Amino acid sequence: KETAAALFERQHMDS
Amino acid sequence: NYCNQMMKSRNLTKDRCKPVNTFVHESLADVQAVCSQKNVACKNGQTNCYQSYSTMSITDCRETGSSKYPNCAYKTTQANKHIIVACEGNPYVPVHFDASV
């Protein structure tokens, strides 16, 4: 139950 | 191999091999900022997509032709391109990566 916003970050962010 | 490592670390190879995924080498704040930039249609016809004015350093991870679950394997391709994300909510933030152009 990650939010969609949290899933986006996990799936796409690489700072 | 960056894509083999990152796709595994980010859970994208546990329940299935995600065939394609893009990683963005920018700050979260700079990606969240795209949600107030150029409003454009999404591939699905919805109009909650936003295109970045600038190009961004991105990496496309794509499964090899022989790859199969659970042994996921990837090829890495670098690009410097404008991103398109779908935005939703309060705060109005990225919820899907639509495309790079």
What attributes characterize this protein structure?
heterodimer; A: 15 residues; mainly alpha; 1 helix; B: 101 residues; mainly beta; P-30 Protein; four-stranded antiparallel β-sheet; three-stranded antiparallel β-sheet; 2 helices; elongated
Question: How is this fold's topology laid out?
Answer:
The complex is a heterodimer of chains A (15) and B (101).
Chain A: H1 4-12
Chain B: H1 2-9, E1 20-24, H2 28-32, E2 38-40, E3 49-51, E4 56-63, E5 74-81, E6 83-88, E7 93-100
Antiparallel strand pairs in B: 1-4, 2-3, 3-6, 4-5, 6-7
Structure write-up:
Chain A: Endonuclease that catalyzes the cleavage of RNA on the 3' side of pyrimidine nucleotides. Acts on single-stranded and double-stranded RNA. Chain A: Interacts with and forms tight 1:1 complexes with RNH1. Dimerization of two such complexes may occur. Interaction with RNH1 inhibits this protein. Monomer. Chain A: The active site is at 12 (proton acceptor). Chain A: Glycans are attached at residues 1, 7. Chain A: It is found in: Secreted. The termini of chain A are far apart. Helix content of chain A is 60%, strand content 0%. The longest helix of chain A has 9 residues, at 4-12. Chain A is elongated. With 15 residues, chain A is mainly α. Chain B is mostly beta strands. Chain B has one domain (1-101): Roll (P-30 Protein), CATH 3.10.130.10. In chain B, 13% of the residues lie in helices and 41% in strands. Chain B contains 2 helices and 7 strands. In chain B, strand 2 (38-40) and strand 3 form a beta hairpin. Chain B is elongated, with a radius of gyration of 14 Å. The two termini of chain B are 25 Å apart. The A-B interface holds A 4-5, 7-15 and B 6, 10-12, 21-28, 31, 59, 85, 88-89, 93-97.
In short:
Chain A has 15 residues and is mostly helical. Chain A is built from one helix and no strands.
